[PDB]
Structures are given as structure tokens and as C-alpha cells.
Amino acid sequence: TVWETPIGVKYTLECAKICDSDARCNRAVLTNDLPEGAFISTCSFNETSYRVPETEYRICPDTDYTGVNAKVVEGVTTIQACAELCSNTQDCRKSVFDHINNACAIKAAEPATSIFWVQDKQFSTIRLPENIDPAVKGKWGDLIRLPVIPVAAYIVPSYPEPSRLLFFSSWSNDAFSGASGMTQFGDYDFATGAISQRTVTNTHHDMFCPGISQLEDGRILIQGGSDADTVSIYDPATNEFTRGPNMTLARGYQTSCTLSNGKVFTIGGAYSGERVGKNGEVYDPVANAWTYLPGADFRPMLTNDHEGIWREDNHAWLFGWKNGSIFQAGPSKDQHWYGIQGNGTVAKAATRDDDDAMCGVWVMYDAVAGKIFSAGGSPDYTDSPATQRAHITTIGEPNTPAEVERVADMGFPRGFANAVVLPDGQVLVTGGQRMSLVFTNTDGILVAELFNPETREWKQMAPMAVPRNYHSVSILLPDATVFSGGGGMCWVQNVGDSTAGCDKTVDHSDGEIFEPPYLFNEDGSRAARPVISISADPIKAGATTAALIRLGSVTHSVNSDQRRVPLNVTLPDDYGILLPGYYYLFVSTPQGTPSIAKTVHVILG
């Protein structure tokens, strides 16, 4: 028995309307689709327009705008009077009416401040609706609710294009501890909009805080984390998980990268296992064996962190390059080549910056010219003002110097931001916060920014709805849209222990999808997209505008699997440019408009 008020609110019919009249009433003697506190991208209820005496504003009932106020005024008794007050306040785009206390808040200016939109019966929100030109600024869809906070996500490789996204958290949907023989997992078909969860127990792996690398045959190698030694192998073709060999050394928060030769190198990972610097190691899918590399020395890639060595070897910016090489772009001030020959190899390649940029974003946007984009991050893991500084790092031959040029500063300092390269080799940076503060919404940037490497300039994109900071993700989707999601998670001392004491306002068990400008004509209508009608055949390197993009895996601001291979409309010879593994074929009109990718499985000589 569910009484649904006209405006759309819903109780679980005489005291009921008594309760709907008192903004302070949850119980009587309230059960909306979303819980109270939930963040929203769109009004969950029937809105109302409203015109001022001199001639407009949209009103969403039972909702709040959180963030700094320009003004709070105690006089006001009515939404209409709060609305009036906004019109008379210079630069007022958003205002809040507090039913309980007869108060009107004018929200401070976006994007200088960030403002969020929450379900809350105590309030009503008023807004001068932004006219957003999708041709200049793209468009965000509405929050997608998910069973599991997507702390880690990867595209499941399929034919003729992928349809699914796995994501995972820890032993719980919204909480982590230490080791626990289990991970909570979520499966989102973005063709059907279908969503399922599952507990993965068979690999005895809590995969929270892991390394992630897609192998040659498109299996995903999930390494360490809460079960610091345990390795899990995800088989797209059976959607089942297999136990890989224990790493030589227990790690968490380390990065891994697939190499030229379909081996996987990892270095660092002082978060879990022993709390000391971790030297390199390399997985051979063929031997099905890990090999400790004592000469792949952690010490040169250490950041200097206020929290010490726990953090310093974390989230290295690793790329497989030519002839089994590894480039380390950061986050440490200085960059380094690493090799797996003999027992190791490490050498300085360049100085990128005069400060470390922990969890800064990083992407190889042009493999064929070894161009790497980097921006944001913070000198320390947490309690650290993020940087606006960005760089193109140019890499020629493995183990010779590399070229770093400071390009223009981002519009916003970002810690814990996420990045994807797009078919045109533009980079989309989403989320992150002014000051790295683990488990916070604080000063989450909502405006996406698109860096043009051809121009070396930034454009501000339309704003998303939720802050995407610690434990968030971004990842390219086959239809050339960006998925942005997660945030939060709560530490509890033991597995099973109650989550009741956790602040869930920082938990964002959901995502949202960006349609970049390139999907829109000058009139805001969706551009006509090139279609493709390709052999589903393992093609090898060097065999015969367009671009390939390797399927992404992503956690903790680390996307080690994504790589843009620009083409001649004809694959390149070098596997250290064309890393083997599953890609996206993007054919795009010479105005800039791309296809729904066709999946292309590159294999080794």
C-alpha cells in the first residue's frame, strides 16, 4: 500500500497528508524511489515554473543545493518570496527555501564553488535553468543507480562491439577492510541498461586497491590489493574468474602495464602487504609465472609524501613501450625507463615538474609519436592542494632521454581526477577536487575539461551532477561517450562489521555518461555517425580519419590499459606502439563525428 502524492512523493491517507505537510516528518502513526540524502541530476518529483512580477525560474520540491551560500536570509516564509529574492540578487542562478526554518539561501557562484543537488524533504530548490549548447559543451545524462560503488571498472571485450562494463568495490558494495576471500561486483549492459551484482569468492581475492592489466587474449589480470599476494584472471569468453600465480611480493595501490611481448610489469604497491618500497616484477601469461626483478628498483620512482613510504611507490604512470621497455611518466617529479632484462634496469628519462603529482591524470593520446598527456594530482596522497600544471611528454626510443613541455594550466586544480583519450585524441578530464582529501565531496570539480593536444589549449565542458574524487573512475564507452562514476567507500576494521557509523553522503554507488561536443551538430541535434559493416578475426600487427583505442581498466586515477593508436585510412609495425589486446575501431567524419566502435583483437607475432 503506497500513497503517491500528486507532486510524485510516496509514503508507505489521513495522517499521511498530515505528514506530507510537515517538512520534518519521515514517520507517523516516507519511501521515495531514492533515499533522503541521495544526490540527483534531475528533479525526482513534478517541478513548477515561476515568473517574477517584472518578466523565469524552475522549482524542484523536497531537494537541497549543498555548498557555500552568497547569502542566507531568515525573513522568508514562502518559495515564491525566496524566488523573488534570487531575481533581486546579482549573479543568483540557484537558491534554496528551507520549509522548517523559513530561510532562503542564495547559492554562491559556479564554477568558483561546486554546488550539489540532494533529495531532502526539509527544502525546495529554485534555479535559472542554464542554456547549455551541446555543440560547444557536450551533454550529461542522468544518474544510473548501481548495486556496488564502482571503485574499479573495465570494458568486457566482445564482438562486434563490447556491450558490458564490470566494476567492483571490496568485500562489501560500499565498504572495505583488509583481506577477505571475496569482492562485490556489478555488471552493466549499456545496450539494454541491464545491471546485476555478484560476490566473487572462488579466487579467494578481495580485489580492492589492485593492479589491472588486459593481457593479449583480452583476459584482465587483477593483482593484489586487500588480498595483497592473490592474483585473479577474468576470462571474457566464460565471464568466470581464475586464480593466477601469487605475485612474488604482496602489493596494493601499485600500477601494472602489459608490455610489447604480452608480459605484465608491476612496480611499487606499499599500501598492502609489507609497508616498504616494492621493487618491480613481471607476469608471463605463457609460463604462467611471476618473476621478481630486484634491479627494477623502486627507489628512483619514490615520491616524497608527508605519510611516508606507505604512499610514495603508489599509482606509478606506467606504459609498455618498444622491445619490452616500460616508461614511468610519474607521479614522481622525475621520469624513468624500467626494463625486465637480466634482474631489472631503471634509468632517469627526464624531469617533468618541480613537485610530485600523486593521482594526477595521465594518458598516451598519440602512440605513433609517443605523446603522453599528464595533468593535476598533488604533492601528497592526501591533505594536499592539487596542481593545475599539465605536460605533454614525448617518448622516442627506450632508454634515451624524453621530452617534457609544460602546456597550459587546467582551469581547476584536481586531485583524484580521471582521464580518457577520445577518437580525435582530445583528452577528457572528469572530476577530482581542489585539495586531495580521501573520502570527501569537498570542492569536487563538476566541470569536465577537454585538452586539445593539436592546439595545447583547454575548453570547459558541461558540468556533471556528482563529485568524482577518491575511489571514482572514468572510462571510454564503445559509442564514444565517457562513463564517470563511483566515489567514497567506508573503512570498517573487520569483514561483516556494520556500516551504520559511515558517512554515506561521500558514497556514490552510481554513474553518469557524457556525450562530447563531437556527437552534436551546431543546432544541438545528434550528428549523423559513420557506421561499419569488419572481419571478427584476430588480426596481427603490421597487417592491413580513423583511430584504434585499447579497452580501458581503471581504479585510483590509474588507466594503464588505455592507448590511442591513430591511423592512415594499415596497422603499425611496432607492438610497443600497438600494444597487443582488444581495441575500438573509431571511423569518424572529417567534421569530427565518430562511429559505434567495432572491437579489433590485435595479437602478437
Ligand SMILES: *[C@@H]1O[C@H](CO)[C@@H](O)[C@H](O)[C@H]1NC(C)=O
Ligand atoms: C601516417 O602517415 C603519415 C604521413 O602520411 C606519417 O608521417 C605518420 O607517421 C603515419 N601515421 C601516423 C598515425 O602518424
Ligand SMILES: [Cu+2]
Ligand atoms: Cu583506495
